[PDB]
């Protein structure tokens, strides 16, 4: 015979405290990012890598109000799925684009020192934009608002074909990690190291990127490992993953505010 | 919206599963988790299986 166990997961009251705490840091990030990226864009308009980086960061920051509004309601989506699909599109397009424009700047700055060139540079920039757009499209396509039959509570998650669910989760996870962290960080790090041949600002660029985006990808990887049941299940583990995911998401969005001061103002 | 299971295993055998665990969560209601003896891995079962619901609803009603 098969022995059947029973498990319950009682509600944890720490959710409200943590979510309301982070809803304030997000507003801090929003205001700082606006007053920083706006100045950078005004300066450039009055080197289009920084313009491209400033535009991408500004568009990512603009979506902060939507996230905090959905957060105060315990990750509840009251708006229509059209806003959900649209919001998840501007965020994911401009979050990828800003990361790519760091890698292009890493090579381009190194390129000039070692060596219609502006035409080639523009072609690369537009190519990066289209590449970011193509990478974002899949997730947004499968996104639709939902209403559970027990909570009577509306959420906005991603529905994937039932016969193939593992495929999409693992595939999209791997795309983000190997095309958002592994490849961009490697190119940026190697080229800046070669350029090292002030010498403190170079190390400053690389360490800031690593600190902002390393713990977040570690948290996502841990979450995905738990989905595949490599890590045994338990309620305390779920709360830790919940807390770690949200905290690291905040520590990532600080990237949109540290970009312009680090790359455009210290100089 | 995050709960222990995201996908089921629609192709499982009675003689393979050696342990079933019922999870009750505020997000995804009841769910089933199975320990396959061959792979010694935790997998999530699909209630569509006839023997699954029969066995489970017999255990709970006891």
């Amino acid at each position, epitope marked *: 015979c098969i022995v059947v166990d029973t498990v319950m997961c009682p509600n944890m009251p720490n959710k409200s405290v943590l979510l309301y705490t982070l809803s304030f840091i997000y507003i801090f990030i929003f205001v700082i990012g606006m007053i920083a990226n706006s100045v950078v864009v005004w300066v450039n308009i009055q080197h289009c890598y920084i313009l491209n980086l400033a535009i991408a960061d500004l568009w990512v920051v603009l979506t902060i109000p939507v996230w905090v509004v959905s957060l105060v309601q315990h990750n509840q989506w009251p708006m229509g799925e059209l806003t959900c699909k649209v919001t998840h599109l501007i965020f994911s397009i401009n979050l990828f684009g800003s990361i790519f424009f760091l890698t292009c700047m890493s090579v381009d700055r190194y390129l000039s020192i070692t060596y219609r060139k502006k035409m080639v540079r523009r072609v690369v920039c537009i190519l990066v934009w289209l590449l970011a757009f193509c990478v974002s499209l899949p997730d947004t396509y499968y996104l639709k608002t939902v209403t559970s039959a027990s909570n*009577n509570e509306t959420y906005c998650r991603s529905f994937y074909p039932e016969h193939s669910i593992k495929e999409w989760l693992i595939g999209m996870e791997l795309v983000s990690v190997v095309l958002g962290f592994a490849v961009p960080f490697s190119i940026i790090a190697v080229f800046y190291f070669l350029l090292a041949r002030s010498r403190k600002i170079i190390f400053s660029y690389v360490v800031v990127f690593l600190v902002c985006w390393l713990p977040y990808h570690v948290a996502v990887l841990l979450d995905i490992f738990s989905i595949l049941h490599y890590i045994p299940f338990t309620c305390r583990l779920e709360h830790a993953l919940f807390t770690a995911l949200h905290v690291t998401q905040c520590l990532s969005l600080v990237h949109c505010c540290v970009n312009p001061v680090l790359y455009s103002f210290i100089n | 919206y995050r709960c222990p299971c995201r996908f089921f295993e629609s192709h499982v055998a009675r003689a393979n599963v050696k342990h079933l665990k019922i999870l009750n969560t505020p997000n995804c209601a009841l769910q089933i988790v199975a320990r396959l003896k061959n792979n010694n891995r935790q997998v999530c079962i699909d209630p569509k299986l006839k023997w699954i619901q029969e066995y489970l609803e017999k255990a709970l009603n006891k």
Partner: antibody
Amino acid sequence: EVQLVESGGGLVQPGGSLRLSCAASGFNFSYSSIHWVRQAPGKGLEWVAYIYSSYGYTSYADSVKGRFTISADTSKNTAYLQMNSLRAEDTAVYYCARVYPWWYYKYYHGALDYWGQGTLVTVSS
Amino acid sequence: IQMTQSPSSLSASVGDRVTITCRASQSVSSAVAWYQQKPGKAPKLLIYSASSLYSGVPSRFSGSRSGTDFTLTISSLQPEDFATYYCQQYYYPLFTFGQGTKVEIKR
């Protein structure tokens, strides 16, 4: 072994109130939601409301919202439907039925496995 | 949702196949159940999901789905199969039943 025995059904004046009970005994009341189904005297079945025993999620039909309120007591293993501002049309036989809300990718199990012999609730002046 | 159930009532003799049909007003992902209420007794469950057979009932009953057009079928009607059959969906938070269909003896 399973049983959902009701009580608290009798004559009531219009605009009054009445509290019903459903003493579940023989299964895990913690894991199962409880529904209330009313069948008028000579008409099809109608749905009233359910409750999640432990997490306290409740939904009400469009014809009882604002008047009925379903609660539960796991320690007592009972579910109470307290009805207020009862009308003449509320005359019916009320059944309480168990459900085990299994998770299906698109929906939840909602077939009322077990029912209890209802209790007439006459509402007449 | 308004789970229209037709026909209003059927006249069938023993040993004659019967078919009661249900129709949802909006798409429900195979979430439909069928009950049988003999007179003056609590209803009973026959077929949950959309075609899955609840434990204990005879194999005669069958279920099917075609978009949003569910059906029930008693392959070989027996003397004790004369009752009212109800159609119930549980996709949306608000459950609904069917108007009912009575099976009457033929004479």
